[PDB]
């Protein structure tokens, strides 16, 4: 079996925002589970992406937050903690403040995104689901 391609460069599926609350995590939480990574790699950001369709004006759909490792993706040039709307920062204890060159971005045409999982007990804002 093969699913439809996800043309985003994030290595993980998005966290869909079903309510009015933006995505945010308490300090030390939010980094997606990746068994092929070390404690040093557990740092990055989520970026809000929005699909837009016409209805007759151009309305938007439920916002989706995609995780990118530190120093990679659409905000590769932003240092950790940099303020920008739609960008929220996450880091597990013990992570290094260095760009994750070795992990990088996903090639959407040949690699499937990993289902975003978070450790049990992770606090999520209202309208978000770990599923």
Author numbering: 42 to 96, 99 to 174
Cite, word for word, the article reporting this structure.
One central protein involved in the formation of regulatory ribonucleoprotein complexes (RNP) is the coronaviral structural protein nucleocapsid (N). N plays a major role in RNA genome replication, translation, and packaging and has further been found to interfere with host-integrated stress responses and stress granule formation. The N-NTD possesses a peculiar, hand-like three-dimensional fold, with a β-sheet palm and several flexible loops, arranged as fingers around the central β-sheet. The latter, together with the extraordinarily long basic β-hairpin finger, constitutes the positively charged primary RNA-binding surface.
All crystal structures of nat_mutants with WT-like RNA-binding (nat_mutants P67S, A119S, E136D and P151S) superimpose well with the NTD WT with RMSD values between 0.592 and 1.776 Å. Mutated residues in the above-named nat_mutants lie peripheral to the structural core, which further supports both the converging structures and the unaltered apparent RNA-binding affinities. In the context of N itself, these mutations may also have direct consequences for immune evasion of the virus and could e.g., alter epitopes detected by circulating antibodies. A recent study suggests P151 is part of such an epitope. As our structure shows the NTD fold is unaltered in the P151S mutant, this suggests a respective virus variant may benefit from lowered detection by the immune system, and the same could be true for other loop-located mutations.
